[PDB]
């Protein structure tokens, strides 16, 4: 049952994000919206938290390819009812208020009711056979050095930022009974597809941020109390 | 996983060997969060980039490991002096760097390499580099990869279970060395722990494709 | 089957919060269900190998909702405070409890330890070099907080039950009180 390859670890489901869906949310409203890049979660800010297994492992490689799977678990009961539409968008992105632009792409409409979960394979449609990682191959900065344009100019590579997105919009407004909660949380999982690939070993993007202590000489280094 | 772990990881970058000591100790354990640098902590002989290697990232997920490790040691010299690399089995301690064993001030008459333990010599004039394979000479079934706190003073027998022994380098005269480490052919990992809490700031030190 | 202490899940409980945790077998001997007949062989024998099965039974009403996760960490001594999140739990062998539906979940726990046997009991004469009675850790964690309706219950309860599928004992000795 133990994973043999890096691709086996990428096939483990991991919680990316969470979003709320309420009865106040009008039709065509973006409940969820993100750039699907397993290289970096953000291009414009620091990340700190529990990254998904497929993102963690993709951080070790310079290249990735293949479909990415998603799973939307709705933390609800039987009395909650509504409809959403998941949409994989390519090349160009849609306006936040324009639902019709999202509907034109590769979509799956989910009728929430008794079933409180939906799977979604995101097709890999790019100009290249593989995508290079947005993160760096080698980063010698260890002590949070204040960056300048000269430092950026002398970087390892140039970040090819992805414009490909997945969005979740309201089709039918959530109409739960008065007895139950009006708003529900939706857990967004991700993993690599069955034909997910990785290549080009490099410096890891992610590194432990909690309870990091270097080893000392036991017992010479003041272990005898 | 095994293919990744069998490539070499650089541990020590140009570290001094001093003949006043017994030798430079290397604890037999793979690269992991145990050897990770944190900005602010005390300066060690270890390199800062061990934590961010592919293998270290893999070994953070598995808390058990069994089998042999392979150590590539390079002596920065072209002299005819022999530099000895002695293997110590699992005794129960965990040390690194230069150490005077039993705090003596003379070790040429009582060398560790001429005590009885398994030893191999490097002759830099012939070859300054060597690759030595250390066995799994321990009482335990598995060797523990990491702990939550490496510097915590807990039960002393359990404290030493993170290593399977030591590798001690002893020179004739003062000379520097560099050390790599990798997994052997006979090597396994187990006890999958899953991914820990992590941080990154790679975005900040690079331009986008739109200038 | 032997029941252990009740677990209270409230609306105040956030994601990643430990509802309960168990260092096994220690906590099933000398804290939870101390008068159980399951604990009788541990009094006399010093060593053993242990494969467990843990059932969880939740009871929240239909107008409530939430998610709880229970996972196992093998050989967790001095590694309980790392790889101890909801994400690490989802990776390791686990079960998921929906608090509205009240689905049951069963954790099959094998013996995965760095030694041959685990020590059963500490003693005054016994060594302090090896910390006994711990080959694994169980964690009960909030995946999604509990929510309720207008004028509804602000909490609901979960009850764990344990049993040894394969408990082999070794090294007979004089009987002692457990911890």
């Amino acid at each position: 049952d133990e994973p043999r390859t890096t691709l086996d670890i990428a096939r483990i489901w991991g919680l990316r994000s969470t979003f709320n869906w309420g009865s106040g949310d009008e039709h065509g409203k973006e409940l969820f919206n993100t750039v699907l890049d397993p290289g970096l979660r953000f291009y414009d800010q620091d990340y700190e938290g529990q990254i998904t297994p497929m993102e963690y492992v993709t951080g070790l490689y310079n290249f990735w390819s293949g479909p990415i799977e998603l799973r939307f678990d709705f933390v609800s009961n039987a009395f909650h009812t509504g409809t959403v539409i998941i949409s994989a968008e390519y090349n160009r992105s849609s306006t936040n208020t324009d639902e019709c632009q999202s509907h034109s792409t590769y979509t799956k409409t989910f009728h929430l009711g008794e079933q409180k979960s939906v799977h979604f394979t995101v097709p890999y449609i790019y100009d290249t056979v593989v995508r290079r990682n947005t993160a760096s191959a080698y980063l010698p900065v260890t002590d949070y050095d204040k960056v300048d344009n000269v430092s950026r100019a002398q970087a390892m590579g140039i970040r090819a930022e992805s414009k490909m997105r997945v969005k979740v919009r309201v089709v039918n407004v959530l109409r739960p009974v008065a007895s139950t909660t009006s708003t529900i949380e939706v857990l967004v999982y991700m993993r690599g597809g069955k034909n997910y690939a990785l290549h080009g070993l490099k410096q890891s993007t992610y590194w432990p941020s909690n309870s990091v202590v270097p080893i000392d000489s036991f017992p010479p280094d003041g272990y005898d109390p | 996983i095994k293919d990744i772990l069998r490539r070499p990881v650089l541990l020590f970058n140009h570290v001094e060997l001093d003949p006043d000591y017994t030798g430079f100790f290397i604890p037999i354990m793979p690269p992991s969060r145990m050897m990770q640098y944190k900005s602010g902590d005390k300066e060690t002989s270890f390199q800062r980039l061990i934590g961010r290697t592919p293998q270290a990232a893999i070994m953070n997920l598995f808390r058990f490991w069994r089998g042999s490790l392979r150590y590539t040691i390079i002596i920065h010299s072209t002299d005819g002096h022999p530099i000895y690399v002695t293997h110590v089995p699992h005794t129960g301690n965990r040390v690194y760097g230069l150490m005077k064993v039993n705090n003596l001030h003379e070790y040429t008459k009582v060398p560790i390499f001429g005590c009885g333990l398994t030893t191999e010599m490097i002759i830099p004039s012939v070859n300054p580099s060597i690759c030595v394979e250390v066995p799994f000479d321990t009482e335990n079934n598995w060797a523990v990869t990491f702990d939550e706190d490496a510097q915590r003073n807990y039960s002393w027998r359990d404290k030493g279970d993170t290593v399977t022994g030591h590798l001690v380098v002893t020179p004739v005269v003062s000379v520097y060395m560099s050390v790599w480490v990798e997994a052997g052919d006979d090597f396994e990992v187990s006890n999958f722990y899953g991914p820990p809490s992590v941080k990154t700031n790679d975005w900040n030190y690079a331009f986008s494709d739109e200038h | 089957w032997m029941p252990i202490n009740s677990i209270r899940v409230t609306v105040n409980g956030k994601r990643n919060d430990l509802l309960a945790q168990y260092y096994i077998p220690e906590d099933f001997l000398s804290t939870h269900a101390k008068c159980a007949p399951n604990t009788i062989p541990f009094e006399t024998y010093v060593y053993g190998k242990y494969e467990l099965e843990m059932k969880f039974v939740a009871n929240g009403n239909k107008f409530q909702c939430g998610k709880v996760i229970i996972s196992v960490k093998f050989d967790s001594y001095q590694a309980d405070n790392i790889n101890t999140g909801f994400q690490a739990a989802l990776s390791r062998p686990h079960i998921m409890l929906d608090l509205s539906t009240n689905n049951e979940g069963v954790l099959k726990i094998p013996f995965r330890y760095h030694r041959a046997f685990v020590r059963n009991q500490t003693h005054k004469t016994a060594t302090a070099g090896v910390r006994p009675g711990k080959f694994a850790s169980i964690y009960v964690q909030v995946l999604s907080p509990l929510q309720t309706g207008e004028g509804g219950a602000n909490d609901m309860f979960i009850r764990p039950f344990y049993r040894y599928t394969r408990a082999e004992f070794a090294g007979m000795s004089y009987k002692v009180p457990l911890t």
Partner: peptide
């Protein structure tokens, strides 16, 4: 001295590890 050596009394048990009762460690 080194603060990693010994845990504070409120969070830890007799053995100098995080107590099972102390849930807030996470």
């Amino acid at each position: 001295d080194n603060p990693h050596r010994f845990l504070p009394a409120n969070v830890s048990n007799r053995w100098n590890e995080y107590s099972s009762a102390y849930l807030p460690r996470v």
